[PDB]
Design a protein around this ligand. Sequence first.
Ligand SMILES: [Zn+2]
Ligand SMILES: [Zn+2]
Lengths: 306, 304
Amino acid sequence: RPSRDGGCVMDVITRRDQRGSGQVVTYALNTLTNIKVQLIRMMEGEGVIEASDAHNPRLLRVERWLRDHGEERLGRMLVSGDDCVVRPVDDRFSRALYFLNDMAKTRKDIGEWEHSVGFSNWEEVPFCSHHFHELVMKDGRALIVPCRDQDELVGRARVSPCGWSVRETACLSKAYGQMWLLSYFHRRDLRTLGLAICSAVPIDWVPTGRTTWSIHASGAWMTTEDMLDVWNRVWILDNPFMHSKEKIVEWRDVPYLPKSHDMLCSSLVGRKERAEWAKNIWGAVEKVRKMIGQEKFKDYLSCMDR
Amino acid sequence: RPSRDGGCVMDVITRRDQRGSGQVVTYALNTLTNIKVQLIRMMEGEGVIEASDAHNPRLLRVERWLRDHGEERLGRMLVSGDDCVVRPVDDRFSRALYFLNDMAKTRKDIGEWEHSVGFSNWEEVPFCSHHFHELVMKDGRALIVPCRDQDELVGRARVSPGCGWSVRETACLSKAYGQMWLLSYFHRRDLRTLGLAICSAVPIDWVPTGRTTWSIHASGAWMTTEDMLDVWNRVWILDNPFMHSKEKIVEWRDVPYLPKSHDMLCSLVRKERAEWAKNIWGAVEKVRKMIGQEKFKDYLSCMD
Ligand SMILES: [Zn+2]
Ligand SMILES: [Zn+2]
């Protein structure tokens, strides 16, 4: 806290409730606790409990439901810390707000007693800051890829952690670029931009730095291995949903979202801006190389049949 | 020698002179004594010896010449085995054919007493199956690159030691050829293309094998699975004693080309070397399909 004399004081405060966000087991506990919250909301909406039970609860009623349906309701939801995706037995769940509000888990950006709005297309359900789309490759195999706002992902990469030398900041960028190639290869702008970053940063500069805070980060991109090679590793070889394990040989064979989706998730695809950026992008790459010096560079941008 | 019975007999024969080509020291002996032939032939053209000396040798005249001139004349010539380049002190050397002929060293493709034909232009002189041209790079540094007829260069690559030979082994051999062309004939447009294409069609793990040339001047440096640019910078810049500035070159796009006309005037850059070069990716893809499920990279595309 700022002191009234030009310097800084540190207060010492206490309290009982709330979760410290940097406890060793915040993720686990928040998951378990939020599972419980959703499991209760399920009960209210099915009819197992009602506002009466806030006063004198019908405990045998909830314990039967768990004995008889708990295991099944558990598999109806994805819960990661404080985020969920819930697929209830029917949409009474929308109106089921009593025990949710009573437990204090007040929903974001909606009236306290306003019905919850749902989705019938899973490709529109948000989870862990992403949406997920299904792509079919040139060989007929399906991918389901995580998508995100292009401007949100570039913008975090433009933020520097000062005192970071030209090498340390180049390495941080390779981290972002490598990651974009694992997870957002299906975004034209980002494949281009990540391929350019890898063509502008030395081959043997190992990447460093935090690219995401999600606990679903592989970090599999903080290697200096070939990025296609790691792609096949995660999307095909180690992917438990890929029955056929035939590796893909060139980036020209890794799919893209449909162009409509690209633009709609805030792609520059279309404008004279993106068009002229894509043209003159090697000039940018050469500047970064000259900035960095006599090191070993390789050319990954051109392997876009360009 | 074939026998008259449907088989083959093996003759044991002897003789005194000539050189066994396989002897451990053919190169050094054929080199040393061809130095001597040419040192002699210099002497005749210079007036040190005449035909008269075949009978009455004026030894002190030749001993004087070696003493007063040997070390200088030694540097006037390049001698590899039976091949030479002589820069004599003047053009009398072209008629100096006695002794050259008396020593039995007959000249190929010329009348026994017909004057030799010389070259004013060092870039037009043949040595070790090559001409040598001077190239300036974009950064102003100069190279002197070896050159050889493309068709002879490719034709030797396009032939194989034999059947009973795998697809993997025949691939590996092709890598060795293509990677060598990248070291030494990168300045040829077609060879640069065909060399990169080969490198794009053959697995990155496959080490090259076989002999791409017999020359006693082949670095051998190409039978690696190192980056070819990485070796190119080594041999043409880092380890090149003739290279004062050692800034490394970053991309094939920066390695120069013969002047366009020398390229076409040295055997395809023609209507058909447009169809070929345009659709060469189809070729690479076919080859990768034959080879199957290995790790290929794309080196042709770093050519634009
Ligand atoms: Zn999306
Ligand atoms: Zn030439």
